[PDB]
Design a protein around this ligand. Structure first.
Ligand code: SRM
Ligand code: SF4
Ligand SMILES: [K+]
Ligand SMILES: [K+]
Length: 465
C-alpha cells in the first residue's frame, strides 16, 4: 500500500510515464502519482492482488522498485535544471553510475547520495550522507567536492539525536568518483553503530570518530588524497517555474505541482493533462527535488502545443513565489508514522501565509517554509528558514533561522503550538522583517541577526536548548 521507483536524477521517459499513469489510475486505491522530494514517484494503496503486476509493469518499461524499508542506498539525486544547461547530461550519467554501483554493501541505515551543480541546492545536499558537488572547466566536469554526513531525522525531546549538515572533506578528480563513493559507504558500513538504529546514520558516526579520522580512512580506502576544497557557492534551492531556455533549440517547462500530487481535480485535470503531454512530447520528464515536474528538451516548434495542454489542465496556474518555495511530506492518510497533517495542511496554511505576506508588503518575496508530519523530517523542515515539525494532531514545533540556501539548521522557537498560534507568531515576525531588514536580507538570516532566535552553530552540541 505504497510503492516507490528507483529513478536516478528523476529522469523518466514518456513511454514510462504512460505506463505508471495507467497503473496508478486502474490498480491503486488513491489513483494518484505522487512525486517525492527525492526525485522519484510513489503509488499509494496497491491491493495485494496487484503487487505482482506492478513489478511486472515496471520491468516491462525498464524500471525497478526501491525497497522502502531496507538499509540501502536511496534514490540518488541530481540537480534537475542547471543554469549551466550543458552540464546536466554528464552530472546525470554519474548519478546513474553511482546509483548502479551502490546496488546489491549492507548498512547500519539507509544511505543518501546526491550529485549537485552549483549554484543550485535544489537537491538539498545537507540532508544527505554523501554529496558530490560538481566542478566544471569549460562546460566539462573535471571533479567534485565531497560533502559527507548530512541528515535531518530527530526524535522529540531526545537530545542524543539531531539534524546535522554535511561536512567538507575536499576535492577529487572526476576519475576517482566511484572509488571515493565506495570508500565512504564501506567506511560507514564498518564504523556505523549497528545496535541502536537511531544512532546508525553517518552523521552520528562522524561525530563519534571525528571528521578528520573518517576522512583519512576514506583516503586510505580510495587510494587518494583529497585536494583542498575548490570554490563553489549557492544562490538558491527553488525550481525555475515556467519556460527556461536550454541549449540550442531546447526549452524546459517546469510545472508547479502542489505536494507533487498528480490527480484529476475539479477544473484541474493534472493527471489527464500530463498523460496527453506525455503522448506527444519528444523528450522526457524530470521529477524535481521540490516535487515538481519538468517537461524537458522541448523544441521551440513544440512549445505552444505543450503549453496549451498544461494551461488547459490547470498545470500552469499562477501561485505566489511563497507557494513555489514551500513543501510538506506525505503524512496522513497513508503514513503509519504521521503525528500531524503535512501535505493536506499545506495548501490552506499557505493561503494564510499569502495573506500575511500581502499584509506586510512582501507578496513578491518568499521564505523557504516547510512542514513535516513527524520528526523523521521527510519534509526537510530542519533545513527551512521556517520549519514546522508535527508533534500531535494539529500541533507543531515551530523552528526559525535556517537560510535560503539550506546550510543552517533552524533552532526550535516555540513548542507544541497550533496553527492560529503559529500564524500570530509569524504575523509578528514577518512584520518586523518587512520593516527592519537590510537590503536583500532573508527572513531566516534576519531572525538570527536581530536576536529573535539563536543560530545553530554546532548541531551535535548546540541544537537543543
Ligand atoms: C515521500 C517522502 C516525503 C515526500 O513527501 O516527498 C517520504 C516519505 C516517507 N518517509 Fe522519508 N520520505 C521522503 C524523504 C525523506 C527525506 C528527505 C530527503 O531525503 O531529501 C528524509 C529526511 C532526511 C534524512 O534522511 O534524515 C526522510 C526521512 C525518513 C525517516 C527518518 C530516517 C532516519 O534517519 O531516522 C523515516 C523513518 C525511518 O526509516 O526510520 C522515513 C520514512 C518514510 C516513510 C517511508 C514512512 C515509513 O517508514 O513507513 C514515508 C512514507 C509515507 C507515505 O505513506 O508516503 N523517512 N524521508 C520522501 C520520499 C523519498 C524518496 O523518494 O525516496
Ligand atoms: S515525516 Fe514523519 S510523517 Fe511526514 S512522511 Fe516522513 S514519516 Fe510520515
Ligand atoms: K530560490
Ligand atoms: K511541489
Amino acid at each position: 500500500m505504497l510503492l516507490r521507483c528507483r529513478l536516478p536524477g528523476g529522469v523518466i521517459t514518456t513511454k514510462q510515464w504512460q505506463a505508471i499513469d495507467k497503473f496508478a489510475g486502474e490498480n491503486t486505491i488513491y489513483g494518484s502519482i505522487r512525486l517525492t522530494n527525492r526525485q522519484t514517484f510513489q503509488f499509494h494503496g496497491i491491493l495485494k492482488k496487484n503487487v505482482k503486476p506492478v513489478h511486472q509493469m515496471l520491468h516491462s518499461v525498464g524500471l525497478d522498485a526501491l525497497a522502502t524499508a531496507n538499509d540501502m542506498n536511496s534514490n540518488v539525486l541530481c540537480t534537475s535544471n542547471p543554469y549551466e544547461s550543458q552540464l546536466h547530461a554528464e552530472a546525470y550519467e554519474w548519478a546513474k553510475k553511482i546509483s548502479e554501483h551502490l546496488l546489491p554493501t549492507y548498512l547500519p541505515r539507509k544511505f543518501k547520495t546526491t550529485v549537485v551543480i552549483p549554484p543550485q541546492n535544489d537537491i538539498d545536499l545537507h540532508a544527505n550522507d554523501m554529496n558530490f558537488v560538481a566542478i566544471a572547466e569549460n562546460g566539462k566536469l573535471v571533479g567534485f567536492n565531497l560533502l559527507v554526513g548530512g541528515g535531518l531525522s530527530i526524535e522529540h525531546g531526545n537530545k542524543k539525536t539531531y539534524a546535522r549538515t554535511a561536512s567538507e572533506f575536499g576535492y577529487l578528480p572526476l576519475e576517482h568518483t566511484l572509488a571515493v563513493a565506495e570508500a565512504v559507504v564501506t567506511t560507514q558500513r564498518d564504523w556505523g553503530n549497528r545496535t541502536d538504529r537511531k544512532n546508525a546514520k553517518t552523521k552520528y558516526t562522524l561525530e563519534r570518530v571525528g571528521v578528520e579520522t573518517f576522512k583519512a580512512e576514506v583516503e586510505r580506502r580510495a587510494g587518494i588524497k583529497f585536494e583542498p576544497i575548490r570554490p563553489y557557492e549557492f544562490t538558491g534551492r527553488g525550481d525555475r517555474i515556467g519556460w527556461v531556455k536550454g541549449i540550442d533549440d531546447n526549452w524546459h517547462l517546469t510545472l508547479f505541482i502542489e505536494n507533487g500530487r498528480i490527480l484529476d481535480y475539479p477544473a484541474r485535470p493534472l493527471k489527464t493533462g500530463l498523460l496527453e503531454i506525455a503522448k506527444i512530447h519528444k523528450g522526457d520528464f524530470r521529477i524535481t527535488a521540490n516535487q515538481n515536474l519538468i517537461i524537458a528538451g522541448v523544441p521551440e516548434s513544440e512549445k505552444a502545443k505543450i503549453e496549451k495542454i498544461a494551461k488547459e489542465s490547470g498545470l500552469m496556474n499562477a501561485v505566489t513565489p511563497q507557494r513555489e518555495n514551500s513543501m510538506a511530506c506525505v503524512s496522513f492518510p497513508t503514513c503509519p508514522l504521521a503525528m500531524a497533517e503535512a501535505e493536506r495542511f499545506l495548501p490552506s496554511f499557505i493561503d494564510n501565509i499569502d495573506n500575511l505576506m500581502a499584509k506586510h508588503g512582501v507578496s513578491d518575496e518568499h521564505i523557504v517554509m516547510r512542514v513535516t508530519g513527524c520528526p523523521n523530517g521527510c519534509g526537510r523542515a530542519m533545513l527551512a528558514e521556517v520549519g514546522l515539525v508535527g508533534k500531535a494532531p494539529g500541533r507543531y514545533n515551530l523552528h526559525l533561522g535556517g537560510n535560503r540556501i539550506g546550510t543552517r539548521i533552524p533552532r526550535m522557537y516555540k513548542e507544541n503550538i497550533t496553527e492560529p498560534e503559529i500564524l500570530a507568531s509569524l504575523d509578528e515576525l514577518i512584520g518586523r522583517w518587512a520593516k527592519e531588514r537590510e537590503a536583500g536580507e532573508g527572513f531566516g538570516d534576519f531572525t538570527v541577526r536581530a536576536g529573535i532566535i539563536r543560530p545553530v552553530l554546532d548541531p551535535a552540541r548546540d541544537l537543543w536548548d
